[PDB]
Amino acid sequence: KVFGRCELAAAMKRHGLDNYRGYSLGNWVCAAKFESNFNTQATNRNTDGSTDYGILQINSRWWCNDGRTPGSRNLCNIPCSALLSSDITASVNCAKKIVSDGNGMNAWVAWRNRCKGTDVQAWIRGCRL
């Protein structure tokens, strides 16, 4: 599923992301835009053999199992395919775990390089929230 900007905002708000660990809604929408272009089906393979999955590009090295990343962990306890679903519940739940692990949203490279320090509120502006 390819979300609209406001549609995803509303979805993330419903799932408890707005102000989660101090990060306003705009930060999550911004990260999703640059990580996956709002496409729940986005996959990208990394040099190390791991793959990033879904709307927030969560990595199979630590967070989910895809049966092809040797010596990896599954800290979200889910198959990585579950992060590609049109329902973002699994991705949200797992992202909450990642952002709590000490490094905040810095775990998302696109957030650090393209959202952090920017007017992220602009990503939810005009939405009925």
Instruction: Report d(CA 81, CA 22) in Å as an integer.
Output: 28
Nearer of residues 44 and 118 to Cl ion, judged by Cβ: 118
Q: Tokens in use for 30?
A: 């911004």
Q: Which is nearer to Cl ion, 23 or 53 (CB)?
A: 23
Report the 10 Å Cβ neighbour count for 2. Answer: 14
Flag whether 101 is marked binding: yes
Phi, psi of 102 (to 5 degrees): 125, -35
For residues 43 to 82, the per-residue mask of contacts with Na ion, x marking binding by CB under 5 A and - elsewhere, is: -----------------x----x---x--x-x--------
Choose, from 35, 48, 66, 87, the residue flagged as catalytic. Answer: 35
Residue pointed to by tokens 């692990």: 101
Active site residues: 35, 52
Q: Would you tell me which residues interact with Na ion (CB under 5 A)?
A: 60, 65, 69, 72, 74
